[PDB]
């Protein structure tokens, strides 16, 4: 089920990496965007909620379902410091 994670973006960004997207499936059959790394010392690490394997559903009202890798990257970088993530845990 779904979890809401709120983060303040640091000078280095959110501090996580992602894989997935339409045309770039992380799992065969699945276009979803997945968290692959939580960055040591970063904002996502300090907060503690986000974990590797989490599916990203949205960021700040931007849908992240059935998007390309590039669209997801662009949505995640072009945000204000106030970051709201909607996330599905395995």
């Amino acid at each position: 089920k779904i979890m809401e994670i709120k983060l303040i973006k640091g000078p280095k960004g959110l501090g996580f990496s992602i894989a997935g997207g339409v045309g770039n499936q992380h799992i065969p059959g699945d276009n979803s965007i997945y968290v692959t790394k939580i960055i040591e010392g970063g904002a996502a690490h300090k907060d503690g909620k986000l974990q590797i394997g989490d599916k990203l559903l949205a960021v700040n009202n931007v849908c992240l379902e059935e998007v390309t890798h590039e669209e997801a990257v662009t949505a995640l970088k072009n945000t204000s410091d106030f970051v709201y993530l909607k996330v599905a845990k395995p």
């Binding site: 990496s17 992602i18 692959t36 960055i39 890798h69």
Partner: peptide, 6 residues
């Protein structure tokens, strides 16, 4: 390099 970090 292979990782895409946000």
């Amino acid at each position: 390099y292979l990782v895409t970090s946000v």
